[PDB]
Ligand binder design. Sequence first.
Ligand SMILES: [Mg+2]
Ligand SMILES: [Mg+2]
Ligand SMILES: [Mg+2]
Ligand SMILES: [Mg+2]
Ligand SMILES: [Mg+2]
Lengths: 97, 287, 129, 51, 81, 250, 95
Amino acid sequence: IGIRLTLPPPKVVDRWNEKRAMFGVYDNIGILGNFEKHPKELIRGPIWLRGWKGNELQRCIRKRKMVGSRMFADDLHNLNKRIRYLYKHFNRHGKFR
Amino acid sequence: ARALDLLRGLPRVSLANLKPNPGSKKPERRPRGRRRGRKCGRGHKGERQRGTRPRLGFEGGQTPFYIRIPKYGFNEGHSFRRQYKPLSLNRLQYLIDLGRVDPSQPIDLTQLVNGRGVTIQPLKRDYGVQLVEEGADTFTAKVNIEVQLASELAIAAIEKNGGVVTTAFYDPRSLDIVCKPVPFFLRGQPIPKRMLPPEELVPYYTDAKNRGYLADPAKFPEARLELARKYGYILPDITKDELFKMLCTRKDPRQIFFGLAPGWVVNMADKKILKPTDENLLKYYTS
Amino acid sequence: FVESVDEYQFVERLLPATRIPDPPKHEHYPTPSGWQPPRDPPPNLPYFVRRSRMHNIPVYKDITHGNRQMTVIRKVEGDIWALQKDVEDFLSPLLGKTPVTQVNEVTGTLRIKGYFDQELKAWLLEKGF
Amino acid sequence: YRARPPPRRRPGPRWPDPEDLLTPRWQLGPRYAAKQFARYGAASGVVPGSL
Amino acid sequence: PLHKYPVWLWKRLQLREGICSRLPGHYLRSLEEERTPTPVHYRPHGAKFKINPKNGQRERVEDVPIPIYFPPESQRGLWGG
Amino acid sequence: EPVLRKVELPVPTHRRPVQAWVESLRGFEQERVGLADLHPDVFATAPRLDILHQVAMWQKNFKRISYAKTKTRAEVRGGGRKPWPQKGTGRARHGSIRSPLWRGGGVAHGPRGPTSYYYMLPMKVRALGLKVALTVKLAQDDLHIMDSLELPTGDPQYLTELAHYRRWGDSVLLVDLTHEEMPQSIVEATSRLKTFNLIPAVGLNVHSMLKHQTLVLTLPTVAFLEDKLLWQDSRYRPLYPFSLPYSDFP
Amino acid sequence: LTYFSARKGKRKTVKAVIDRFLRLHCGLWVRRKAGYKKKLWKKTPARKKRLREFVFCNKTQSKLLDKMTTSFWKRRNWYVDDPYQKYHDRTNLKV
Ligand SMILES: [Mg+2]
Ligand SMILES: [Mg+2]
Ligand SMILES: [Mg+2]
Ligand SMILES: [Mg+2]
Ligand SMILES: [Mg+2]
């Protein structure tokens, strides 16, 4: 048996808190603001991902370049190993040549 | 309209109603079930399936196709063979008519680009424009065009209508400045001075047959009359034109913009132009 | 060491413009290139075909699979079916059969099999678009 | 709820302190000062003669 | 996580915190300053630019110093460089 | 005393403008204070709901970083040695106690690192979406116009009652011109309420409009919107970012 | 080839092709008939005539070489005096 018996507590979502009521506001700051700013300049998050996209290999390479010299030793060694593996995989393994 | 009337009697539009346009969001494929995944499409056992088949272009040991064919310099030097974006007379007429370029003002590269007539890429070894004979017929415009090359037919097409065409040169560093000036005026560097042609090109820009900007401005009439005599029209006396003072205007070598002297600094914030006064700086720039 | 001069007139000749300028009031048509302006007042038909940003006729060639030739009449406004009937009448004599077509009443476009860009441009000029 | 004040670009010239260590190598020198002058005028404080 | 300063700035940070912070200014300047040694084991390229023969264009050139080992026995003598 | 308003930018000669009432918040029964004209290409575009979908989905996803990481088979602690030799025993072959197979191992294919989902649609598509949203919220008797968002007193009860009196809906999105010029009364009132949201015109977006049922623009706002959205059709292709100076672009 | 570089993460081209084939902008590839420079003394004159020619590459070869070269080598190239300027475009192609 892998199914619960009593009902879960009700997850109450407040669809009108501040974060949801104001979602998206200023996502047209460029078109409606004389192009002073750009939408990407509102993306809050990692230093090395604000307004950029890519597969895991490119993401790891970018992380190494921009914060590789600030990383803890073991995390950085893991990152280098990961880049090595992904290089081998994306460049030698796969259905399509 | 019609559809806007339909919307009135439908429910309010909201994030609960949206949809993708049919045919756009193709469905996904995952290896689950008796069809998608039992071998998930990878085939029988063999290095195909494991994802370990040789590199793209390996013909199984037989000497590959791209290695048994001898080398030949189809591309040797390609990064240094200069390139020029054509500007057909058809396109020049089309731009003139719709008011994009202004024939009552000297047409340099800057005014071809600021009207989005051609797209110059300095960084890919484009040096400038070349007029091409296409559309010599039907071209009827009085333009003072400064380009970087010209077939003799284009020279004709521009002269027959009382126009002056002159072939200038722009080095890769100044071409970027002339093509997209406002970025340069933002960099803050003082306006550089145009370099002279390379060794291989001076015989081109010092020949009256090509309306070169360094050939002597006294052999031009002979060239113009020769061209007219070959192409069966009468060289109009431009000296009597209502605005010949404009068709005369030219940029001297070592100048990028028309009314700006190398060494000035453009201040766009305050609407000013700053000029030096130290004798050494003037000496360097005026040469 | 430096002195400020505010002539400035020769840089403003370098600043580009963002708006496409209204084409100037020529005196004969078609202009040397072949550009006519749309008639005025607009012709009285069920539909309309707007001019682009650069004032040309929205008739565009198109190709797919390297052998499917098509044309699109794009910015059609109003009853696109009337324009479909008109185009079918106009093209049927040329091809020797009624030409297969698609109508996308949402985007407002009429797509036509075969290459007929110049014919359609002329025809939409005659009717005064 | 009143939406937060809009995101406006960092006004005026951006002079980074030179004694700090994170202020990168390229935000101190002649080129950055030239760019600030060109983009903000005499208010930037750059003496023109340095250009 | 991530440090607030990179790894190679830790030395320069240390030269500002503790006992090293009270050293006189000129000593710190003489310590932080870096100078390339005069070339000894390699022929330095004369100029900042050069024409190469394979194609014929003007390419930039730099001189990359050979890395040389000084065993500690030299610290008691004057090997020159 | 009517408060009229004509469309400033040129209208195509084959399309008449659309129109709307100009209401006031100064009183419960102050609708039809004036009559305003609205430019057809910004308030009467083709419906085009699918573009509304494109824009709302981009507006949801372009600012998403997924902070989900799962330790691969080489990032989990330990796991170096071969647990038992290959041939001797009778157990299954294994070359680590941290394969995905084993308990406590690593995920073979899991969320790797912080993932960005950013992408940008052509600017024209997003402006077109804005126009589509405005026209849909007009065609369905939901868009309004106000001379100003002024109010008699900042008490939120007044604003919510007024919204009840006119069948506005559950939620109202009030839009004013500049963040500094919204009157004191409206900002004070709309701080306490929950389904009433006050934004300056520079923040108008598709998702925040499709969420709220009613959209209430000031008149200066509609002028601003017509200017900034008509600028997209009939502009050249860019030569460099519009943040850099141009001859005609403020 | 290398589908992702270790240092930038872009595709990379196989430079052994650039030195052997020319991409006419609209699809075709031209090569130079291996066996043509050397041993020209016991080859019949007709054979020598054949070997000097610039020949095209069939569909599979062209697709392969398109894969082994990035986008830069497929652009529109406006060279001053290009002996292959007139071959960049197909004219009157039925299917
Ligand atoms: Mg998949
Ligand atoms: Mg063998
Ligand atoms: Mg391990
Ligand atoms: Mg093992
Ligand atoms: Mg675990």
